[PDB]
Structure 1
Amino acid sequence: KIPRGNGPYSVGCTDLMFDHTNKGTFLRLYYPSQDNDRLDTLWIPNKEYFWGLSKFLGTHWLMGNILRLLFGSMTTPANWNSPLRPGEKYPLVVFSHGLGAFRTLYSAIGIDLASHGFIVAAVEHRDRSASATYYFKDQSAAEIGDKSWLYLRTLKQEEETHIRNEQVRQRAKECSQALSLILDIDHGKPVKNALDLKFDMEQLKDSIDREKIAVIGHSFGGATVIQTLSEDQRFRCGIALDAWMFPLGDEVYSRIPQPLFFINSEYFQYPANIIKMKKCYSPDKERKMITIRGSVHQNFADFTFATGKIIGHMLKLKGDIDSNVAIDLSNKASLAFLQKHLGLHKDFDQWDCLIEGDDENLIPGTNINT
């Protein structure tokens, strides 16, 4: 269902939580793998994520059990806990999920990046923007595996502006903290994974190309990309996938020195949002924008592959365009942009035309009038 990566490398996957608290880092790692004979990765790994999704969709908790029945055994094509492919320093992408999502729902992107030689750290935010997430109250709880769950916060109309901005700021701090953790692991720092999994983090020592770091994200995660870039210069460039610009404070628009690429869906965008994207532009800064023809907001997330065409188009999970075609365009254009602004010595420049929207299923810039 969820597509395999298009690159030459097999892909592995694991989870890392450090420290064990609600202030620690929680991420799902996708990486180039040595082996390809392991069990596939469980897509949504706990029942509480389904209860969280039901609250996010506005239905009763019992609908969560129905979602669990339909999707609870589904996997994604990544070798769970497989050894890292040795003998090469890989560039790093930190990925930020949308409102109501969590770390595991962008594996199509994560797996494809990893298949082309990236390590991808998909963060799980503890700002109450995730449908659900978990942590451990103290050291004892972590030992026995007694999880404390944190669910999505519903906002009153009056809370919107202030709380969304507090959330995007926390999200940015979580992205920076995840980077610092991965870089420390790269420089041999011993870390006790709060989750007891058969993947030794010592394998990641000397595995990261420390200057080739990017941040990518969808919707609320797209705003997170921009906030993160403005406050952490260790990130060399960013790619915002159908960014939702509402959470950003007025101050961030003029302080994004890094190259920034907006990849939009045809049907999600609107003038107020496009105007905010245009405020990030300046003659001295590198900016690109493309729109995928026939695509919808959900083409960037994994649920676009989870159902058939009829049920998909009804639930707003698919657009007029084929989902595999849409994600290939976003992923290939992303690789070209990454090679250019991280200075990679790969063949991703074969997709440079996609950065300019030069393709039958792409629109240069945007279809929205402002």
Structure 2
Amino acid sequence: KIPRGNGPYSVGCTDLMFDHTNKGTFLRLYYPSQDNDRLDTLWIPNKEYFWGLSKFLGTHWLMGNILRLLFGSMTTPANWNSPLRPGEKYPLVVFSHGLGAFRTLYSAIGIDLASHGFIVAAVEHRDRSASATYYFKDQSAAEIGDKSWLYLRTLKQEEETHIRNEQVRQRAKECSQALSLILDIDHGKPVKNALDLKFDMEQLKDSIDREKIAVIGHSFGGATVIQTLSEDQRFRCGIALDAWMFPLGDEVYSRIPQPLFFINSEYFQYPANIIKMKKCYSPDKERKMITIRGSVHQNFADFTFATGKIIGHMLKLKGDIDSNVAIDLSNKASLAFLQKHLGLHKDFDQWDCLIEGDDENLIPGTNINTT
């Protein structure tokens, strides 16, 4: 089971696609909810995501069918289409998923954030870095629900540098676009959700704390944080979760004025990557780095909760550290950082010491030597 949020607020979930096209925004929203008696949220909502995952793993599509059998009824503890908790303006996080992932696979993070009074928009990227995603060819297709699917692009070695950079720039634009959509809904612009879901978007009117915006993401999503910050000053700070730095252009490193927090796994990182993170540092800029002891790259994503301890460790979905312990640290340290750099008036400064890696399961900075 994917853990429930640790915060005081109940959590709701829904999906927004606007416009309906491959250039529209697709996101999963996690938000403080008024009610706590709704059905839980289906974790991986369509069979095609499992086919996507099968291609990402480099297996036959029939492994996709097997993955569906195993995981296709799994839920995540968020009240599907629950009304938004009224009477308060919430800060906003835009969240960016990893390569071969998609919008629904970081619910442990999204739910926890929402339970502390954030609205979280987990974008689904259309750069062919998602295992799968979908949209509609035209207005007619959107009405009848005739989905067009877009699957993960496999690269040749000679395409890697160039295409990963094209992808990270698209990802950043998608983050900025998702922000604009949410800010426009906040004002009260009518938006007809291309998905026919019983969550009225007008609830979001006057519900966003409009200057309190952050961008967070895992791996490819971590590079996306960085690209996004350099190009969109509306994002006040960023948190990169085990960032994969390879996609970034040489130009971006000196171009990130906002506070930036690197939260790393012990076992993912390597000198080339760490060197790139250190290129983000300058005397006038606020940077923080911590490393979670005993953790692996997948501790930041939901599949760390989806299997047992023995299978999970074999598949590199789990580390030596307990998955809930690990995500608690990442999520609490994130909260403290956000409160600091968004100027929130909550109690998240109780976790300030985690920003400095002061905890028995944290390493300050990095375990990686780069000399």
User: 1:81 Cα shift?
Assistant: 0.1
Q: Deviations 1:98-155 (Å, cap 9, x if unpaired)?
A: 0000000000000000000000000000000000000000000000000000000000
2: distance between equivalents of 1:322 and 1:34? 32
2:177 aligns to what? 177
User: 1:346 Cα shift?
Assistant: 0.3
Secondary structure (helix, strand or coil) at the match of 1:337 reads helix
User: 1:225 Cα shift?
Assistant: 0.1
Secondary structure (helix, strand or coil) at the match of 1:358 reads coil
User: 1:333 Cα shift?
Assistant: 0.1
Aligned length: 370
User: 1:312 Cα shift?
Assistant: 0.2
1: distance between equivalents of 2:62 and 2:112? 34
User: 1:160 Cα shift?
Assistant: 0.2
User: 1:315 Cα shift?
Assistant: 0.5
Q: Deviations 1:51-110 (Å, cap 9, x if unpaired)?
A: 000000000000000000000000000000000000000000000000000000000000
Paired residues for 1:321-360 under 5 Å: 321-360=321-360
1: distance between equivalents of 2:40 and 2:364? 37
User: 1:340 Cα shift?
Assistant: 0.1
Q: TM-score, length-normalised on structure 2? A: 1.00
Secondary structure (helix, strand or coil) at the match of 1:133 reads strand
Secondary structure (helix, strand or coil) at the match of 1:93 reads strand
User: 1:365 Cα shift?
Assistant: 0.2
User: 1:322 Cα shift?
Assistant: 0.1
User: 1:191 Cα shift?
Assistant: 0.2
CA RMSD of aligned residues (A): 0.3
User: 1:347 Cα shift?
Assistant: 0.2
2: distance between equivalents of 1:352 and 1:143? 49
2: distance between equivalents of 1:102 and 1:291? 25
1: distance between equivalents of 2:8 and 2:63? 40
1: distance between equivalents of 2:288 and 2:315? 30
1:298 aligns to what? 298
User: 1:324 Cα shift?
Assistant: 0.1
User: 1:8 Cα shift?
Assistant: 0.1
2: distance between equivalents of 1:87 and 1:17? 25
Secondary structure (helix, strand or coil) at the match of 2:213 reads strand
Secondary structure (helix, strand or coil) at the match of 1:212 reads strand
User: 1:7 Cα shift?
Assistant: 0.1
User: 1:313 Cα shift?
Assistant: 0.3
1: distance between equivalents of 2:318 and 2:26? 29
2: distance between equivalents of 1:330 and 1:321? 13
> Does the alignment pair 1:311 with 2:286?
no
User: 1:167 Cα shift?
Assistant: 0.1
Q: Deviations 1:9-38 (Å, cap 9, x if unpaired)?
A: 000000000000000000000000000000
2: distance between equivalents of 1:148 and 1:367? 44
User: 1:205 Cα shift?
Assistant: 0.1
User: 1:290 Cα shift?
Assistant: 0.1
1: distance between equivalents of 2:148 and 2:268? 34
1:77 aligns to what? 77
Secondary structure (helix, strand or coil) at the match of 1:254 reads coil
User: 1:203 Cα shift?
Assistant: 0.1
Which ranges in structure 2 are unaligned for 5 or more consecutive residues?
none
Q: Deviations 1:307-338 (Å, cap 9, x if unpaired)?
A: 00000001100000000000000000000000
Which ranges in structure 1 are unaligned for 5 or more consecutive residues?
none
Secondary structure (helix, strand or coil) at the match of 1:109 reads helix
Identity of aligned residues (%): 100
2: distance between equivalents of 1:270 and 1:171? 24
Secondary structure (helix, strand or coil) at the match of 2:225 reads helix
Q: TM-score, length-normalised on structure 1? A: 1.00
User: 1:168 Cα shift?
Assistant: 0.0
Find runs of 4+ consecutive structure 1 residues off by over 2 angstroms: none
User: 1:356 Cα shift?
Assistant: 0.1
Secondary structure (helix, strand or coil) at the match of 1:252 reads coil
Secondary structure (helix, strand or coil) at the match of 1:264 reads strand
User: 1:239 Cα shift?
Assistant: 0.1
User: 1:180 Cα shift?
Assistant: 0.1
Q: Deviations 1:204-257 (Å, cap 9, x if unpaired)?
A: 000000000000000000000000000000000000000000000000000000
